[PDB]
Amino acid sequence: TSSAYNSVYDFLRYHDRGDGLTVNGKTSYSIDQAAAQITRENVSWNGTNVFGKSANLTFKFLQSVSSIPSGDTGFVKFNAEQIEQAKLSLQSWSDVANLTFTEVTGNKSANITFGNYTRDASGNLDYGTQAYAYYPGNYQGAGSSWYNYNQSNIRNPGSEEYGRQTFTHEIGHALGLAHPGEYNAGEGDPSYNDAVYAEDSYQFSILSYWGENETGADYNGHYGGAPMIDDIAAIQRLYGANMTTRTGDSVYGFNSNTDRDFYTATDSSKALIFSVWDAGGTDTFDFSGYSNNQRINLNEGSFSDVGGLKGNVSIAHGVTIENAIGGSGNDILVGNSADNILQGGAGNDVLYGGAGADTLYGGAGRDTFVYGSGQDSTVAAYDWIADFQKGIDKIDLSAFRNEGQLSFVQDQFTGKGQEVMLQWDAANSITNLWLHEAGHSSVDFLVRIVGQAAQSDIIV
Amino acid sequence: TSSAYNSVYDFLRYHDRGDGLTVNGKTSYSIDQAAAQITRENVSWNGTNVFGKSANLTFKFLQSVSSIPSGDTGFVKFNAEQIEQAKLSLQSWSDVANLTFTEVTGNKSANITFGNYTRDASGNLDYGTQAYAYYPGNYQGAGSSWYNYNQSNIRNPGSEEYGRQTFTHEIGHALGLAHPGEYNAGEGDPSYNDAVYAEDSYQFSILSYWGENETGADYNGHYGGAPMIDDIAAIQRLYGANMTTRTGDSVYGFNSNTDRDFYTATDSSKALIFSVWDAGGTDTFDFSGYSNNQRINLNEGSFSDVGGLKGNVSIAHGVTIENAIGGSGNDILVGNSADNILQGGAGNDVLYGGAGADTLYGGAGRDTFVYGSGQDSTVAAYDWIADFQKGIDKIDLSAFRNEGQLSFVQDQFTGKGQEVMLQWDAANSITNLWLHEAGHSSVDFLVRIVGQAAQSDIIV
Ligand SMILES: [Ca+2]
Ligand SMILES: [Ca+2]
Ligand SMILES: [Ca+2]
Ligand SMILES: [Ca+2]
Ligand SMILES: [Ca+2]
Ligand SMILES: [Ca+2]
Ligand SMILES: [Ca+2]
Ligand SMILES: [Ca+2]
Ligand SMILES: [Ca+2]
Ligand SMILES: [Ca+2]
Ligand SMILES: [Ca+2]
Ligand SMILES: [Ca+2]
Ligand SMILES: [Ca+2]
Ligand SMILES: [Ca+2]
Ligand SMILES: [Zn+2]
Ligand SMILES: [Zn+2]
C-alpha cells in the first residue's frame, strides 16, 4: 500500500483510546470512562446520583461578601472584562448541556457566584494561588467560585488565555465536575505521573491539571478556553445534551458563523483549540487560512492537527460534521460515513472520503484521492471528483491489493474480477472509473470524474 | 414484538431470494445469478464473451424486404403507433444500459430492425404466433425483430399492453438477452414447471414466458412494458450501466417528472408496473393518489405492493431512492439506510425509517413510527417526527425488548440502561425522546418530535 493510503490509515488511528490499550504506560480510557471518572463525585444541581436531568440555574457577580467560605480575605468584585469573559465561559457550557443560566442581582441568592480575593485568612497578600470553586449542594458557599485578583491573568481574562480557561474550569466544578484524578493544588506536588488514566490532560479535559503535551498534543503556549471532548461527555452525562445548539449549517474556523470566539479564526495567526458540539445541519471545518500542513478528521470523537498545532481540534461524541477545507499546506482530509465535501486547497493534498457519496476537490497542486474499500464508492452512492487534473493528480486504489493486485482493462471486463476501467463520456466530459471487485458478481464500485483522467493517474 | 414491528420485519423479507433458499420448490437465484442466466448466450453487439462494454447502435423500420429470415411471408411495414411504441421500448433499454440508438433509413444497414409478417412459408395466413427476434451477430438477419400483424396487440401496442411488452422483449433478444430458461414457442408446451429457477417470471424479467402470478405477484391483467429488475442487471452486465439517467431529483408515480409512461400514473385507475433505474439525486416514490393499502420499500433490490397490485414495483440494484408518499389507505413505508422523508398520507400507516436521519410525517389517521434498533436514530443522525399527534399516533419501541423490556423514567436516568424518557422543550415546542440502551455508557438514541407526546403514546 502506498504511503498516501498509509498516511490515512495511521491518521485514522491518531490518539486511539480505550479498548484495553495502554498509553504512556498508563491505562487508556474511552470518552465515556473518562466522563464517568470526571463525574465520580456524583453531585449536580439536581442532587446526588441524578443523571441526565436538565437544569435552570442562576449566577451572580457578588458586589460584597460577609465572608469567603475558604477563609481567604480581601474580597474584590468582578471587573467588566471578567464579567464578559465569565459569561462566555458559562455560554460554552450551556451550549453543550441542557442548562440555562440567568443572572440575578441585589440580594437574590444564586446557584453559581463569582468573586475575587487577594489575601489569605491571616490577612497577608496572596500572589501565589489562582482560583477555586465549590461543588453544587445545599451548604453555605455551594457553587461559589473565587479567583485571585493579584494574578494578571484573572484580572485580564480576555487578553490572557489562562484566565478565560480558569473561568471555564471553576464553573465546571460549580456544575458538579471533578478533576480527572485525585489531586488538588496545595496538596503536595502532584503531576501527570499521578494520573489515573492516559487521557488526563488539557487535550481531553480542561478539568485536568496537566498540559496537552503530556498526551502528545501541542498548543504552542495557548490555552483553549472551552470544554474539551471528555468535558462535553461529562457535563452531558449530568445534565443531558443540548440539541438546540447550532442546528443550522455551521462553519467552524475561518469565515465562521458561530459567534463564538473559541470556534473562530479571523486571520492566520489565530490559534484554534476546540472540541465541537453541533446539534444539526450541514457543517464545515473551514481551515483554509492556514499555510501549515494540516490533518483534518471529520469522524466523531477524532482529533485533528490544525493551523500548525497538534491535537488542537476534536469533534465530540454524538456529532456529525460533513465538510472540510484545508489550507495552502500539504494536507490530509479524512471524511466520515456521511456525504462529505472535501476541499484540499493549494498544496499537495490527500483526500479520503470514506463511506458515503462524497464530492472531492483537490484544488491546486498534486492531490491524491484515496479509496480504502469497495464500500467507499458504491454505484448506489458514488463519489464525484470534481476538479481532477490529468497527469497531475492521482487516484489511489492500492488498498485493493489486499485481495489481489488490480489490473487495468481498456473497455471490457473479463469477469476474473479485480479489474479497473476508465470510460470517457464525450457528451458530458465525464470520466467514469469502474472497479469490478473480487467476489462481486456485478460491477459495484464507481467514481465519477469531472474531467479527463489517464491510466497512469490511477495507482494500483 | 408488536404486530406493527412484525409487519415491517416480514415486509423487509418479501420475496427474499438467493442465499441457498428454495421457492416454489425451485432453486432461488439472486439478481446476479438470474442476470448471468439471462446472458448465458454470451453474445452482444460487441461480440462473444465481451462484458461491460458500451455500444452505439442503429435501428430501422423496414419499408420492404427481399425475404424474412425465419421463412415467414406477407411482410407489412410498421405503422405510426408501432413506430412510436418501439421507440419507447428502445428508450426503456438505453435508459438503463450504456447504449445509444440512432435511426437509419433508405438503404443503410442497421443493427436492430423492425417489421411485421402475416403468413407462413407456405403462404397460409398465420393468426396464431406473436413475435420473434434474432441475436446480435454477423449473420444475415442478426438483430432483426418480427411481429405478427394479424394480432391486434401488435397493431395497437399503444392501447394493448402486451404489444408494447412484446416490443421490449424482442428488442431484448436483439441486444443479446435470452429467456431465463431453455424453452421457446413452437417447441412443445413448456411451463413455469420447466423453470430453471424460482424467479423466472414477469415479476423479475420480461424475457420470461411465465406470468407474475407464478411468483406470487399480481398485476391484475396488466403487462409492464419495460425491463424488470433482473433484465436491468442483465443488460448492464453486457453493456455497462447508464449513469446519466435521471440524475436530478426524480419523482416516480403520481406527479412524475420522468416523461416515461411506465413510471407515470395520471390518476387512480392507472396501474404501475416498473423496476426503477435512477443514477443520481434525491428521489421520491409518490403513490399518493391510491386508496388501496400499500406497502412501499425503498431498499435497493426490494419489491413493493402499489396501487392494489402485488409485487408490481421494484428498485434495481445500484439505485438509491430517498423518499416515499403513501395514499389514503393503511400503508407500510419502509426506508433504507439513507436519510428518507416518509409521508404516510391519510389512513393508519406504519412508517419505519431504518438507519439514517429520517423525517417522518404520519399524516391523518392513527400512525405508528417504528424503531427496530439503536442504530435507527443515533444522536449524531437523529430522526424527526414532524406531525406527531398526542393520544393518536404511537412510537413503537417493542423491538428493544430483545435486550430487556424498556422502562419509562420521568426526568432522570438511573444508569441501569434500557430506559426511555420524554423531554418537553417549551421554548421550541419540541419533545425529545431519549433512549438509554443496554450496553451503552452514554445516552445514544434520540428521536425529536415536533409537538407534544404522552408516555402512553410510546409502545414498549
Ligand atoms: Ca450545525
Ligand atoms: Ca452536521
Ligand atoms: Ca492544502
Ligand atoms: Ca464520506
Ligand atoms: Ca491541493
Ligand atoms: Ca490538484
Ligand atoms: Ca465515499
Ligand atoms: Ca434521480
Ligand atoms: Ca437518489
Ligand atoms: Ca396512508
Ligand atoms: Ca433511513
Ligand atoms: Ca396516516
Ligand atoms: Ca397521524
Ligand atoms: Ca432513522
Ligand atoms: Zn480544579
Ligand atoms: Zn423471447
From Swiss-Prot, chains A, B:
Positions annotated to bind Ca(2+) 5: G345, G347, D349, G362, A364, D367
Enzyme class per UniProt: hydrolase
NCBIfam families in alphabetical order: Zn_serralysin
Residues the record lists as binding Ca(2+) 6: G354, G356, D358, D376, D383
Residues the record marks as active site: E170
Entry GO MF terms: calcium ion binding; metalloendopeptidase activity; zinc ion binding
Organism name: Dickeya chrysanthemi
Binding-site residues for Ca(2+) 1, renumbered to this chain: R246, G248, D278, G280, D283
Cofactor(s) of this protein: Ca(2+); Zn(2+)
Full protein name: Serralysin C
The keyword Protease is annotated on this UniProt entry: yes
TM regions (residue ranges): none
Family: Belongs to the peptidase M10B family.
Cofactor descriptive note: Binds 7 Ca(2+) ions per subunit.
